[PDB]
Amino acid sequence: SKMMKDVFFFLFFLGVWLVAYGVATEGLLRPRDSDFPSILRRVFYRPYLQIFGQIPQEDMDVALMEHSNCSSEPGFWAHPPGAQAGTCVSQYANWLVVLLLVIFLLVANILLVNLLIAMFSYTFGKVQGNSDLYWKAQRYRLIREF
């Protein structure tokens, strides 16, 4: 219970860093099939499962999909094979998407988790000597209750 001074720091830093990646990705791809739950899902929930070893690349690139023009606004369009990733994805400057994916994975995966390990070690090695005494104090009352 005394290690809850760091999980809130982790949630703060990850939420601030996560919302921006989500909005930038869904601004660059521009899905031409949109609602409220689809956009809210595809902005928050899909980046959150990428820091636990689930990186689907089907809706990110275009060089794994079929070049199909079924859209009416001028440009070039591609067809996703999955579900929930609309039916049309733009192709204008697609390399910026891959570069943002690399930046986000390097920040969340290699810096934050290891920093959180360091903070748990430093907090534990200090507070252990007080927590042990406080546990030794309450044992009489917990015996007396039964």
Which residues are near its own copies by CB under 8 A?
A: 3, 5, 7-10, 12, 16-17, 19-21, 23-24, 26-28, 34, 39, 41, 45, 48-49, 52-55, 63-64, 75, 83-84, 92-93, 96, 98, 102, 105, 109-111, 113-122, 124-125, 128
Q: What is the distance between the alpha carbons of residues 123 and 40, in angstroms, rounded to a whole number?
A: 36
Beta bridge partners of 49: none
Minimum CB separation of residue 131 from its own copies in Å reads 13
Of 79 and 116, the one with the shorter C-beta distance to its own copies is 116
Of 45 and 135, the one with the shorter C-beta distance to its own copies is 45
- Render 54-76 in DSSP notation, one character per residue: ----TTT-STTSB------SSS-
Of 20 and 140, the one with the shorter C-beta distance to its own copies is 20
Q: What is the distance between the alpha carbons of residues 42 and 50, in angstroms, rounded to a whole number?
A: 12
What is the CB neighbour count within 10 angstroms for residue 11?
10
Of 71 and 109, the one with the shorter C-beta distance to its own copies is 109
Minimum CB separation of residue 133 from its own copies in Å reads 17
Q: What is the distance between the alpha carbons of residues 6 and 119, in angstroms, rounded to a whole number?
A: 7
